[PDB]
Amino acid sequence: KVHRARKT
Amino acid sequence: EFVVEKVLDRRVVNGKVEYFLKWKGFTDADNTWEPEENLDCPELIEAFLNSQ
């Protein structure tokens, strides 16, 4: 799947 | 949150696991190191690496 993450 | 295109590297910083991400539709100049808890599934990286 498409993953997303918090960017600092 | 932003879409992750790829995971490029891993490092441990005083116990703390971080990963070097390329973000989708941003260039390499925008790559960042992120703490594991910023990812939805860091287990997938760990599982990939621990199986070799």
Residue numbers in the entry:
A (entry chain B): 159 to 166
B (entry chain A): 29 to 80
Could you give the paper's own sentences about this structure?
On the other hand, Cbx3 chromodomain can bind to G9aK185 peptides with comparable binding affinity regardless of their methylation states. Six amino acid residues of both peptides, “KKAR(K26me2)S” of histone H1 and “HRAR(K185me3)T” of G9a (referred to as binding motif), are buried in the binding groove of Cbx3. In this region of both peptides, the carbonyl groups of H1K22 and G9aH181 form hydrogen bonds with Val32 of Cbx3, respectively. The imidazolyl group of residue G9aH181 forms an additional hydrogen bond with Asp68 of Cbx3 in Cbx3-G9aK185me3 complex. In Cbx3-G9aK185me3 complex structure, the side chain of tri-methylated Lys185 is anchored in the same aromatic cage. In addition to cation-π and van der Waals interactions found in the complex structure of Cbx3-H1K26me2, the tri-methylated lysine residue of G9aK185me3 in Cbx3-G9aK185me3 complex forms salt bridge with Asp58 on the other side of the methyl-lysine binding pocket. The root-mean-square deviations (RMSD) are 0.7 Å and 1.8 Å for the aligned Cα atoms of the complex structures of Cbx3-H1K26me2 and Cbx3-G9aK185me3 relative to Cbx3-H3K9me3, respectively. When compared with Cbx3-H3K9me3 complex, the α helix (residues 70 to 79) of Cbx3 in the structure of Cbx3-G9aK185me3 complex moves 4.9 Å away from the position of its counterpart in Cbx3-H3K9me3 complex, which may result from crystal packing artifact. Because there are four Cbx3-G9aK185me3 complex in one asymmetric unit and the α helices from the four protomers assemble into a four-helix bundle. Consistent with previous reports, our research provided structural evidence that Cbx3 chromodomain interacts with automethylated K185 of G9a in a similar molecule mechanism compared with H3K9me3.
